[PDB]
């Protein structure tokens, strides 16, 4: 699996440091194209970053900051596109990688494939053991069209550098090694050429190429400038539709593709939504609507009528800038079955904000979320009323899509709570991103959740530390109800099973339905207890009805 989503945490420091490296491993392990930003921060002196050795392309910016590791192994990184830029300016940013006062800290940049920076510039500052950055011909790396192609570099040092390998033609090198010489691709080309593989006109790259090439065709690119149409580099993706040019009537085009990142795609990847206009997104464009199409796949169809009203969450529409659920906005979710956006519960939710007269959210008010079935963004709970021992107001939440992730990484975060179990008894799917559950001191029934089953891609995981130790829980006589298949549950009681062993009466696991010897006599329909018409004569040790209606009764 070549493509993965990067983070969005910047210089903020990891909310749970003990699982920080593990998050990074899971994210980038065996990934080559990084949608979004590669942020490598706060990595301790010894950290094995082997998992990064496969990244070719970073879509956003690269931030390497606040690390003590001597080396980050990004030798295969070729292109960084700069779709978003650190500090709105930098495609690459290397900062404060030293010891917080044998010494730790980044020593060589070792970016030996970095041949292309498409947009934005380079920031290098406060790295006391770093060598050879003042050696690179940065003009060559920045694309011909990079309008923010700038440099800010610091060469303050606490060690003496060695010269580049004698094998390096000029002063140029990404490190002490011979395989570290900077390879030039722009400043040494014949004619107008944007990129090349040598001095000769025949060494020129195709106009559609991006990092350089192995030959003159558009199938020889090291990277695509615009799109990767199944091996061939092009400017656009094949239209979804073929036109007449006189009538301008359209047949569907079987060759047609959707734009996803920097590649043409037959169908948009899992969590995304295809678009009548030929794209893949996470928010339907205006006057379009999310519909569960005739597969199961989500899709953005046009609305004939005005689009039906929808519950927006945090980070969305009129709550775009809102940090948390408060008494000031909680009623807004009343009745909502699906929230387009995210919900975050912070300490400021529950202790009020005096400042701007916002009453503390009282716990009974959380009952609004009892109708909620789906969240498209993320759930974030860093505070929760002490009087409530579980998240069972989310009782009916079936999916958290993760189309928006917290810090760009986590779709479910539960930290610092002192709930005793989760109680999210309907949660069947975390659509993308990680679950992080740390520092909930009384929390049990974590190991009982089959997280394994909630996920939808290999980069997902439950990161967890500093909760109540499982042996301490069992030791306090705590367990899935006997009626929970394979031992899995979200809490105590027959209501909390992931899959009901016998039969479902309401949301309750029961050993027996009420078929022969019950109070309200019931019928079974695909492992479910369902009542007859209240006016069906109960039978003595026999079937009372065949169905729910009056024609199905026995008398």
């Amino acid at each position, epitope marked *: 699996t070549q493509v993965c989503t990067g983070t969005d945490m910047k210089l903020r420091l990891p909310a749970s440091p003990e699982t920080h490296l593990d998050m990074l491993r899971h994210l980038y392990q065996g990934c080559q194209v990084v949608q979004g930003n590669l942020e490598l921060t706060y990595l301790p002196t010894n950290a094995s970053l082997s998992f990064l050795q496969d990244i070719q392309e970073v879509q956003g910016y690269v931030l390497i900051a606040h690390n003590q590791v001597r080396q980050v192994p990004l030798q295969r990184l070729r292109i960084v596109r700069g779709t978003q830029l650190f500090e709105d300016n930098y495609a690459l940013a290397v900062l404060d990688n030293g010891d917080p006062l044998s010494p730790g800290g980044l020593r060589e940049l070792q970016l030996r494939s970095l041949t292309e920076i498409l947009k934005g510039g380079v920031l290098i500052q406060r790295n006391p053991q770093l060598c050879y950055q003042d050696t690179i011909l940065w003009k060559d790396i920045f694309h011909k069209n990079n309008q923010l192609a700038l440099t800010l570099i610091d060469t303050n040092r606490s060690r003496a550098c060695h010269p580049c390998s004698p094998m390096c033609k000029g002063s140029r090198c990404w490190g002490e090694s011979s395989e570290d010489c900077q390879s030039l691709t722009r400043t040494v080309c014949a004619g107008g050429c944007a990129r090349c593989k040598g001095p000769l006109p025949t060494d020129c790259c195709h106009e559609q190429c991006a990092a350089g090439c192995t030959g003159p065709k558009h199938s020889d690119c090291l990277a695509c400038l615009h799109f990767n149409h199944s091996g061939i580099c092009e400017l656009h*993706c094949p239209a*979804l539709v073929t036109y007449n040019t006189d009538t*301008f009537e359209s047949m569907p085009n079987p060759e047609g593709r959707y734009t996803f990142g920097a590649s043409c795609v037959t169908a948009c990847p899992y969590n995304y939504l295809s678009t009548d*206009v030929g794209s893949c*997104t996470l928010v339907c464009p205006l006057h379009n609507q999310e519909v569960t199409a005739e597969d199961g796949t989500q899709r953005c169809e*046009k*609305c004939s009528k005005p689009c039906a009203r929808v519950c927006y969450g945090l980070g969305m529409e009129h709550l775009r800038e809102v940090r948390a659920v408060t008494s000031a906005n909680i009623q807004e979710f009343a009745g909502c079955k699906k929230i387009f956006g995210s919900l975050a519960f912070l300490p400021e939710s529950f202790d009020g904000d005096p400042a701007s007269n916002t009453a503390p959210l009282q716990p009974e008010q959380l009952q609004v979320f009892e109708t909620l079935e789906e969240i498209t963004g993320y759930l974030y709970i860093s505070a929760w009323p002490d009087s409530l021992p579980d998240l069972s107001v989310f009782q009916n939440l079936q999916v958290i899509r993760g189309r928006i992730l917290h810090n760009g990484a986590y779709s479910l975060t539960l930290q610092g709570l002192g709930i005793s179990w989760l109680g999210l008894r309907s949660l069947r799917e975390l659509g993308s991103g990680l679950a992080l559950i740390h520092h909930n001191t009384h929390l049990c029934f974590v190991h009982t959740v089959p997280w394994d089953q909630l996920f939808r891609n290999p980069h997902q995981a439950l990161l967890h530390t500093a909760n109540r130790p499982e042996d301490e829980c069992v030791g306090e006589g705590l367990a899935c109800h006997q009626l929970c298949a394979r031992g899995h549950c979200w809490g105590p009681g027959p209501t909390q099973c992931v899959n009901c062993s016998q039969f479902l009466r309401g949301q309750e696991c029961v050993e027996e339905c009420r078929v022969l010897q019950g109070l309200p006599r019931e019928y079974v329909n695909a492992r479910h207890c369902l009542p007859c018409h209240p006016e069906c004569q109960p039978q003595n040790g026999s079937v009372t009805c065949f169905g729910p209606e009056a024609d199905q009764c026995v008398a």
Partner: antibody
Amino acid sequence: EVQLVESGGGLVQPGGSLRLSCAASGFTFTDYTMDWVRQAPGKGLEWVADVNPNSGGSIYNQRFKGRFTLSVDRSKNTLYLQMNSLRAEDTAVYYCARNLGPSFYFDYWGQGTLVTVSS
Amino acid sequence: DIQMTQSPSSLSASVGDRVTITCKASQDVSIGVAWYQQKPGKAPKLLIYSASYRYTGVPSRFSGSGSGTDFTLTISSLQPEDFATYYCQQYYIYPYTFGQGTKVEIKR
């Protein structure tokens, strides 16, 4: 806030060439088609064409087949309308607008750049 | 090619009057009509789409009605800003064509 800004208007001699830009912000550019609509002094609105950022393909008014050409540069969320063989009748304000539902009515319209074709 | 014919060409009303403009399609265009407002120097604003539906935030007094050939815009009670030009446009069928326009002007 959604915004669109036309630029590149001016005075050209009949026959001459000209190119107009439309730069866009406040929305996902790659999620909408965009259009040129023009307005001759004192007259009304004539639709020109509809370019798609994903496909690169335009849907154009037959009046202009082979003179006006459309281009997108999604790297800078910019459209380009390229006019060749310019004549009097082309002298107008050239609005750039957003094709809404990729049906053909438009919500946000730019300020519009003026083109004057005279000797 | 399709013509949208607007009536009247210009009209003079005072503040507070109800104001109705007609737009007549030469050819059945189901409900594929929008309505635009435009002032001197300014660009068009979309007011009605799908013949009868208010665009986001367009004040309630604006209403579009009709289907097929005959279409109508009605400002329930004129307000000082409304004095401007109103175009209709069919988008149902290619090529997309706008009406020749209606000037609403302040009477004294």
